[PDB]
Amino acid sequence: QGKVTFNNTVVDAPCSISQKSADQSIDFGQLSKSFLEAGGVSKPMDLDIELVNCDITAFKGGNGAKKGTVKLAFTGPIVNGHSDELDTNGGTGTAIVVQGAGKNVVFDGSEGDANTLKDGENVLHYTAVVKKSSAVGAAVTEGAFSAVANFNLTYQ
């Protein structure tokens, strides 16, 4: 059945993602509390997601494709009242914002933009930055932080 069954009929597969790093992470490096505390935003880190095993002619399509057979969407703990701010661990007071095709990514499940596919390749290009959380009394404190976002692909 499907993968244990064998014959001429090709069965297309869902995508498998991977990044430059083995743990599927992006390192922001040490950040200045003072800078963040003053409204500063870290230098944008590239968040590239490689799509393998699947026909990319569905993510903004490869060489075209206007239809949408796969829905893309990010999910993660948000900042109270700000669905576009991925909350963080460690209590540092920081938050994370990811930008797609010029527009911010929302982490409440709403359909994302399956239009970030780098024309010509099989990579979704996003950018991420760290900033003082936009929550009342945030206060950027020092220390290490981390966050996990769910990249959801739903197939029709």
Partner: protein, 216 residues
Amino acid sequence: AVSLDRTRAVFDGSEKSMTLDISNDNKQLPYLAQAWIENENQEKIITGPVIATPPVQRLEPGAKSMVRLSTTPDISKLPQDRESLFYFNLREIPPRSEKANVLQIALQTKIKLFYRPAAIKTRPNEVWQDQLILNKVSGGYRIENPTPYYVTVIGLGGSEKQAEEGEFETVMLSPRSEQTVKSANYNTPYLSYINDYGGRPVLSFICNGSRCSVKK
């Protein structure tokens, strides 16, 4: 890192269970894989009638593994003359990062799981979608699905090429149901759907009046 083997799953009701192959495409680190079922409204279902086992498992680098899909006795309550809709979920849990200030991405794959009762068991390359009917309506078409299965329509156009590459909002018709779509009048309609294998065939219609059916 974790991935599934198909974009949709058909559960043959004449059987008590089936397996889905999963894989850790990462060659450096282990990843956890969670699997679970959702009902037709995408609500998590824990006690049946369809169960995914194991709910969570560890996959060493490059490891291949499987998730079993099985049913409880109550699966018999579902209608036996039409498909029922479920969703299969596969979410990975990446290992904790070695680095300090970091953001990790975790993939989650969600596909359709069709419960196909024994009474409507299908042949290896049987085609029922050619049973679809098109009804001209003001501003478009009413797509009729008189079959006992779920049909996913991904294209409607005046030519085979347009059905395949033309802008179209994918719509899935439940068994014995219909849906209206905005569209231009085509004297020769072509429709494209997704079959059990993830293939995307194209049907050619011949209209007579405001009714259109696939040509023999």
